[model samples]
Target chain A: KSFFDKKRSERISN
Target chain B: AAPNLAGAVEFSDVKTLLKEWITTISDPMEEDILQVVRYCTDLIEEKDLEKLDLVIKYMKRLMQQSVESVWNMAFDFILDNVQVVLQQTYGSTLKVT
Candidate 1:
């Protein structure tokens, strides 16, 4: 359940 | 017994707290959660082990309950303050709820 990420995921754009 | 529970409590009041804390979210059962609150309002009246027992029993029945480590590490954020609200001596209260 680690929620960290600096960059937005391409999955969201797709 | 309804212990004139100094009104700082929200579940005891008619207002509903809708900030979802259950990691096992029951989306359709939202009203059911509110319904539980309705009952817990009454439960808060008794300042005893009975109050703690009812909270835990109902949570276990619904599979929403967790131990302290689980609460602090995983699911609960501010929800476990039921510890404060239920108001009891530590050792026995720690054992049960």
Candidate 2:
């Protein structure tokens, strides 16, 4: 997966 | 550059982009993190040694000031710019000193 997609995941978990 | 992204950054051009970026971002934490990323991109692009330690020092100081949510979002772009460095070098490793 693209890092942005992974970080979009992080946007929620944070 | 990533397969999906445009061509990678040029070493000579990063400084100008950074100067413009500084004025454009309004958030304190976001601006600082983005600046460090700019410097890192500059370092990778130019391979210029004179300003090398400056960016490293600034990023360290800037990192300590931000909260989690800000840092996480800020770091995403930082990681993106760093890919330019990571993809270009052979067995390249970043050293603080």
Candidate 3:
């Protein structure tokens, strides 16, 4: 996955 | 944690950091963006329609600045990506709004 994809997932989970 | 709205406050607190660096040019633009989103969420949750305009203005400015910063940074990063040692370093920061 892309860096932003990971960041987006983290934000969503948070 | 309700204190003076515009008074001197410590940076150790998330709320204080949000209030102080929300409009700072050098701050992490993404963090400011997230704070603006959180601020809007708080306003809606609290039904604070009276402060909508003020909060919206802040959000708009932060969004614009953040987008501009990212675009500029992306361009610079792309231009330098060809260099052997110039790996793209795009990091984001956040505030506690």
Candidate 4:
């Protein structure tokens, strides 16, 4: 995953 | 003659883009976010430090405004940008100074 994609996931995962 | 990397890019470029993007956005809410994402993607791909720095400013502003939905994305981007600094040599020198 790209940096922005990973960040998008993390922001929602929590 | 040695080329100056900093001389080419202007912070104003991002400002103009932001103004144009906002003015042209079709959707009031969602499209603004889309515009930011698209331009930010362009900024990073170009490694346009001046423009990215401008983005950092806007992200910080957005995070504080706290849209509840948008906050997380803005916060995440800010975090990612900060992490990039730590990984660079100039960033090391900056922190040491």
Candidate 5:
């Protein structure tokens, strides 16, 4: 996944 | 945690960033775009990252579905806003890089 995708997933799990 | 952050560095930086971006736009912005920026900036000023996270997600969806012109501005706005959010959450150790 790209930066935005990474951030999106991280944010969701956070 | 909300002690006069209206005068803080990141606060001024993002406020100026959004102000500059708004000046560059030639056409009227969509209400969705304007509303998101309005609330997101307010959240930033309050240093409310928890709510800011959800707003940022809303912004991401908006950007993804926006037209090219709208997407351009939204991209920059969300990019900078996300940076501020991350900096708020993680300190200066890990940045957008």
Candidate 6:
């Protein structure tokens, strides 16, 4: 969950 | 856990998707909102500091076309409120602000 959350955050932030 | 959706989940996915689409529309809307706010804020600040003589004349000219500004502002407000509501209801911690 943490990994996926971080990945999603990065994707959206970009 | 088992209230509002108990009878509607199967049918409400389309509605949910539409709501998400509406929220997504806010990206452009937010940009327009910030643009207008920056323009207005700059105009106001420049006027208050007596720089209006240098800038306000041009700004005032633009502001005279109030219909466009008012339309965008209203749309932006609507989009922003809808975005906040949708995010509060459905967004996860991964969602970026």
TM-score of each: 0.30, 0.38, 0.33, 0.36, 0.37, 0.23
Instruction: State which candidate has the highest DockQ.
Output: 2
lDDT of 6 by residue, B3-97 (tens): 11112212243233223323433333444333323332332333321322323233333333343454334434533543344345544211111
- Give candidate 4's error at residue B77 in angstroms: 7.7
TM (chain A) per model: 0.28, 0.45, 0.58, 0.47, 0.50, 0.62
After TM-score superposition, the amount by which residue B52's alpha carbon in candidate 6 deviates from its true location, in angstroms, is: 41
Q: Write the per-residue lDDT of candidate 4 for residues B30-66, one digit (tens) a residue.
A: 4344444455444444555455555556555545444
Model 1: CA > 4 A from native? A1-14, B1-27, B51-55, B64-81, B88-97
Residue-level lDDT of model 2, residues B38-58, one tens digit each, is 556655556543444443344
- State model 3's lDDT: 0.35
**What's the lDDT for residue B53 in model 1?**
57
Q: Which ten residues in a row have the lowest lDDT in candidate 3 chain B?
A: B81-90
Q: lDDT tens digits, residues B1-97, model 1?
A: 3421222233323121122223333332333333333344345444444644544443443344432234332212222444444444342322434
Q: Give the alpha carbon lDDT tens digit for every residue of B1-97 in model 3.
A: 2221222122223333333343344334444343334433343345443453443344435544563465334323322322212122213112213
Mind giving the per-residue lDDT tens digits that candidate 5 earns over B3-86? 112122254443443343334433434543443444455555566655555444544454444554656566566446546655
Point out the worst 10-residue segment of candidate 2 chain B by lDDT. Answer: B1-10
Give the TM-score (vs. native) of candidate 6: 0.23
List pairs with backbone clashes in candidate 4.
Answer: none
DockQ of each: 0.02, 0.04, 0.03, 0.03, 0.02, 0.03
Indicate whether candidate 3 or candidate 6 has the larger lDDT: 3
Interface RMSD of each: 16.5, 10.1, 11.9, 12.3, 10.6, 14.3
Candidates by lDDT, descending order: 5, 2, 4, 3, 1, 6
Q: Write the per-residue lDDT of candidate 6 for residues A1-14, one digit (tens) a residue.
A: 22223423564575
